[PDB]
Amino acid sequence: STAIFSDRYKGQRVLGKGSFGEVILCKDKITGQECAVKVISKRQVKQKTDKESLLREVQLLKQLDHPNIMKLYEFFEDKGYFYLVGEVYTGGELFDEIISRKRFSEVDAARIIRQVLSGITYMHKNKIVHRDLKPENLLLESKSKDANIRIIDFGLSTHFEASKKMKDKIGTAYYIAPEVLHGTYDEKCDVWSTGVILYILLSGCPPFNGANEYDILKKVEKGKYTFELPQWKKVSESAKDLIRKMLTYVPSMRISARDALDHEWIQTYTKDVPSLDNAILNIRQFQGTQKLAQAALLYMGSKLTSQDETKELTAIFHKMDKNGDGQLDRAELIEGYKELMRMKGQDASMLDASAVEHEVDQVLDAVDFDKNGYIEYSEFVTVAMDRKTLLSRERLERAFRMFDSDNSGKISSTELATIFGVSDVDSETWKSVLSEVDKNNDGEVDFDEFQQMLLKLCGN
């Protein structure tokens, strides 16, 4: 008989959203082992391969072992989902840690890139390609400072189709190898992606850039880039030589991961070296922008999900309310909330019956109602839904504050252009919405105004 994920694991909390699914911090019900589970919804993510081929890849991945590669422990599958259980890392994304440091030299970059190349080299030896390598897939193992980089998502993109949705696409275009765009690719695509990441570590700007996703993709496909920016004047010849070799257009002429590890630049800088201050500055701006556009798309999504789940939940309860007096008990609210999850797939957070009981009790305990009596469902619906959004509403706010590095209270129109370009919101569409909110021609918006624009960009 098939083994069941929630027989073995309980959810602690959501860690975040990555490629193909939500990632949840889980705990083994017997051993207390904490793990990070990536939950992939079959409704939302299509498979590329047969079951057979996926099972064999999983089995291989459970056996592979390298210090710069996320350890996979278990794999489960049921009717609606795939569950990929792996080791928890607590150090967060590499670039998030880099923006927090006072100095950053080529030696720091070389030590980072060596780790990435070492992980990749090993995976290539095992005939596993990443293809979607980017900064978000480089996690630090712990929150220490000599912490190792662990690369996540190796092998996934071969078996599951990427989302076409921008909220899931943010960041992808800078890093993708040109040959991946055209369909004929091999493991060399991962060296290209690393070259891009390295270019960014040493200058703070993407080598291939543009005002929207398609403009970025157009630059990538032409494959041309330069080292003419001022901050390249501070950088060694050997680093630009390696970059050139990694960003070589024709894959057969591009350096391999293994050979890159032997490059002069890696050798010299990983065994009287200035800080790259202008690069740190550009990376923190790049990062903040990426994080705010991401938060803007999630917020818009969250509002739409709420509009959808509010009405669904009310209809479920109306139906359930046989007598029609507006009064359900706690087990009924639970059955209805379950009914909502049965219909939805959005909550990886509500893995089993027991997580749903708990969530109901959280809402009741907020709403000043006794859990042992009968309850007005319309009031319960109102509180339950804010719970889900405000997470995104307060993360939106948090992300607006982090982007506003000067504590000015405002985002300029130029900055909005940048943010919406990354978010791939049409230029005349956002300006139009900004016209409707900025009637004083300040050419800038505060947080509430920004939020209002986003509500207008999602049909509110």
Ligand SMILES: CCOc1ccc2ccc(-c3nn(CC(C)C)c4ncnc(N)c34)cc2c1
């Ligand atoms: C074959 C590789 O496929 C997988 C399988 C499981 C994963 C579990 C966690 C993560 C993961 N994703 N994230 C980043 C999230 C917050 C976006 C993690 N943070 C900490 N520890 C982790 N392990 C993760 C990625 C996975 C990728």
